[PDB]
């Protein structure tokens, strides 16, 4: 019941129930804690109108520790790749009943970034993450293999197809295992910028020994992908589209939750998540991802938990 006002203050929301199912708490203690914590710059007691005028819109506080706050639900307005010669740290191998299902990105010492599509079950007694691996089964190496349980799942905004999962315990960070930074809030990529995907997936090989496979790529404008897709894509703000030039090579099954990492200026940085769409690896057809930039702030607010 909201349109054209993504800013909280414009919407006096008369509702008291979050996305998950937990009722909002007494706003005043939250105002104390937030004024201590959040530094944006008298809003109602215990109604999910968001004070902070956040990008994603109205949101509410919850008492429970594991979920301090969440949105109250309202309407609003790799195939043909190369093996990697060297061990890599951002890669997170997600393991479901003791086999790989998706790749993920390592953000902090206890936090990984993946896609909603990759969580068939919500259960955590079964998921198990590995870090620091060169072979999808680990037969290649084990020194850098880090086995961790999964502590908790946090879903993105509605319509995000984006998810974070937080670990039972932290990890030791060394050369073998590495994290990656995040974009600036509006960090907008130059057109024709080169950057690559790393994947663990189907790869279109009669046999794949289990090396993680790298595929280069170039960012294209949303307009160019509208042309190639012939109106089959209705492009929204949050997506990016980067497409292989003159060759059909792209991520496919198993690569969901994979990172689009790109080098901006001097260092390399993540920009996207590999998510399924539009088909697989069609020659002279681009690829479509979700831009972390539209959600980086939300990542920050949640990572403050």
């Amino acid at each position: 019941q909201d349109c054209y006002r993504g800013n909280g203050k414009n919407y006096m929301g008369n509702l008291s129930q979050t996305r998950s199912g937990l009722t909002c708490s007494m706003w005043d203690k939250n105002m104390e804690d937030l004024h201590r914590h959040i530094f944006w710059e008298k809003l109602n007691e215990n109604y999910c109108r968001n004070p902070d005028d956040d990008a994603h819109g109205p949101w509410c506080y919850t008492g429970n520790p594991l979920i301090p706050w969440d949105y109250c639900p309202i309407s609003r307005c790799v195939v043909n790749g190369i093996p990697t010669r060297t061990n890599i740290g951002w890669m997170v191998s997600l393991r479901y009943r003791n086999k790989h299902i998706c790749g993920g990105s390592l953000i902090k010492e206890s936090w990984v970034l993946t896609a909603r599509q990759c969580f068939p079950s919500r259960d955590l007694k079964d998921y198990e993450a590995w870090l620091g691996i060169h072979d999808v089964h680990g037969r290649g190496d084990e020194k850098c293999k880090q086995v961790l349980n999964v502590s908790q799942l946090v879903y993105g905004p509605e319509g995000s197809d984006l998810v974070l999962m937080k670990l039972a315990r932290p990890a030791v960070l060394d050369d073998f295992v590495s994290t990656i930074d995040l974009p600036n809030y509006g960090c907008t990529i130059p057109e024709k910028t080169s950057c690559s995907v790393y994947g663990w997936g189907y790869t279109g090989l009669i046999n794949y020994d289990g090396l993680l496979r790298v595929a280069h790529l170039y960012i294209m404008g949303n307009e160019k992908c509208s042309q190639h897709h012939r109106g089959k894509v209705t492009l929204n703000e949050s997506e990016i589209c980067a497409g292989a030039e003159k060759i059909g090579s792209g991520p496919c099954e198993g690569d969901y939750g994979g990172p689009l990492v790109c080098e901006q200026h001097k260092m390399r940085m993540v920009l996207g998540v590999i998510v399924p769409g539009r088909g697989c690896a069609i020659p002279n057809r681009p690829g479509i991802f979700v831009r972390v930039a539209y959600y980086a702030k939300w990542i920050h607010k949640i990572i403050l938990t």
């Binding site: 068939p120 189907y202 496919c252 099954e253 399924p276 088909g279 697989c280």
Partner: protein, 688 residues
Amino acid sequence: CKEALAKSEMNVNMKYQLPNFTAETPIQNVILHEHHIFLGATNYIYVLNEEDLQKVAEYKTGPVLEHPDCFPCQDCSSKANGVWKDNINMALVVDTYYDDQLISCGSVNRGTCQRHVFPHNHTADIQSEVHCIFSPQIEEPSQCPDCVVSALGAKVLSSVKDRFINFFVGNTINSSYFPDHPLHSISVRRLKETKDGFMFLTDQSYIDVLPEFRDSYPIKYVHAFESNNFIYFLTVQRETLDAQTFHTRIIRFCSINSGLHSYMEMPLECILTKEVFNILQAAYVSKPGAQLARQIGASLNDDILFGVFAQSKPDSAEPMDRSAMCAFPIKYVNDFFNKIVNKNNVRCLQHFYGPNHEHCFNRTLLRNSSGCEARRDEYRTEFTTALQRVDLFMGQFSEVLLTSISTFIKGDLTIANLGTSEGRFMQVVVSRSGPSTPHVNFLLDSHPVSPEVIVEHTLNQNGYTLVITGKKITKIPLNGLGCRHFQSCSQCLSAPPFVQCGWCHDKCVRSEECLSGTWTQQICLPAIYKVFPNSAPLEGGTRLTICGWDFGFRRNNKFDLKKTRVLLGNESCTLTLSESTMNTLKCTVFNMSIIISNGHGTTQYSTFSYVDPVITSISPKYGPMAGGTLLTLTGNSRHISIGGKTCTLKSVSNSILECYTPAQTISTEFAVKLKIDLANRETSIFSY
């Protein structure tokens, strides 16, 4: 003379030339897509252009060798040892999320499904490129993620959730089929994005009837559709595992690919009034017209479920050929799921949980407080208090079996494309307000109408409805297939205005043809077929039957029999209510013209007689008294007697008369008095 004037009733059987396409084999499913209309049929798939139904192209999934060891989509033509079975398509869907493809889903070949790809320049050429969808399940070969569709009966519904083509499929299962190769009663399939298989995302994603109730408790699904982030299903099945008696059921769950999470069955019944109709025959989901919106209380934009029920042969599934159609505003049924039924109407679900097993000893239902949050201890619930509806036609179809239905809107009215068991295709302006007579009731074909129909509605003024009967696919313009068939003025004026035509003095006719300029659609003249009798004595106020039509005044449905009067000369004959119908009049009052006045107009008819009776001659004159002889009379509704005893008329005429004389214990002669409702002039004496 009600029979004779039945020519007023519309000619139920008139023949129409409509674009008619015929196939070599029965047609099961049909899909409309991008100016082509594909058909699945026994051993075949066809593609059709619309406006002509020219078979532009075809692709041949003919008979297949079924041999036990031959794998499904490996090629075993070389095998010489084992039967040339045939396939019948049961699922034909179109996908365009990935690429413009068609998916066919065969019967015999283990129920493994295949794809056809549309080239960019030319779309009809489906034969050029074909794959199979077969993934050897190396991990767990024990289960089939790719053995999709059963044989006995199935419904398949495609959807795109989460950038994910999901097939929600229901199967009918015979006990024999399982141990060879498993199947499932309701299941959710992800298509692997590389388009070479399906995966079951979780053991939780399917529901199969427990091993013991396979042979008993067969469920056959009849319709499947999506709305409001829920995927409903409509099926038919036993009231209880040992009830040996049936009703329709509805299935609800939301559309998380992980599995069927909030799985709720409810009984659905439509009654008449308290006679219930058990079995559903077909259904169609549509939006309602303005008139019906209030009349069932639904908003103009809400989805609506139309279902035609047939009453069953008791303790059996076979329809009894007594039917109804009933409307279920989806908000109401969804509400029933959420709020109305209280706690202890709910139960566990028999065929899956098994009647005796731990959970449904006790479980809380987060039924109101939660709407399909994917929990761990999801509870599949079987309700017991059927959602009762009442008929929309008030049982005007109580004797004729309905088999296929569709609905579109037009102006503010909403129309139904009904179809019966013997191949008659009606169209009715449906409203609870008035019993409305079909404006098209032609006979289509000898075979029953298939439930699979398509209606396409371009620019709200040009549309059409493909319907399938036996081996025939036909295009009907919904715009009013005609109005030539109407012959009774009242019928001409009741035909809904969207078909522009009105009465011109002799027959319902399109406006711009008959020249007289008498073409009218609002007021029109009463008419008389005949009058019985036309011979009336001066004193005789006698019963005159009047055969005609349009004897009622108009009210859009209710035909006002009170604005009627009869004028004879100057006096008005005595008009009696209980025997005056828009069909006929029954009144009781020198050739004279009778005039009949109605609330619209009046009719003159030129020949009624106040004939003056004449009697002149009698036979015999002198004779005995035995009382068994034959009297003959002559001159110009009567009776005749002598001495208090009626002589039976041995012969009747205006100019000849014959009685058999009463026996009278007397030997003299009597003047015999005619009693034509009245003692008119007696004759003379005859010697007894």
